[PDB]
Symmetry: C4
Subunit: 31 residues, 4 copies
């Protein structure tokens, strides 16, 4: 249902942390 959608969206909002920080890995290889 809606509860087990809301708590996928809060997995995606983990993936969009690990997007940011595993880019910021690459950027801080490049400064």
């Amino acid at each position: 249902r809606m509860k087990x959608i809301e708590d996928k969206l809060e997995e995606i909002x983990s993936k969009x942390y690990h997007x940011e920080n595993e880019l910021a890995r690459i950027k801080k290889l490049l400064x």
Copy 2:
């Protein structure tokens, strides 16, 4: 509910800005 899903999707559609621009950071280190 559906309102507080719709307004996660419009957080994701912020993350997919910061995807693009913090890639375009890396690409403009690389031209």
Copy 3:
């Protein structure tokens, strides 16, 4: 509603094209 969620998910499934191809920009700068 559900129709205007489904057609955000099919924006995200555009962003996850432009993820892939604007990475594949960087990778083809790096081969």
Copy 4:
């Protein structure tokens, strides 16, 4: 409906594999 949303979210949770591994492509070009 909700079933064919849940099974988009489990496409996105494929895209957020291919995010990670096609970054980890770039990082392992850069070590």
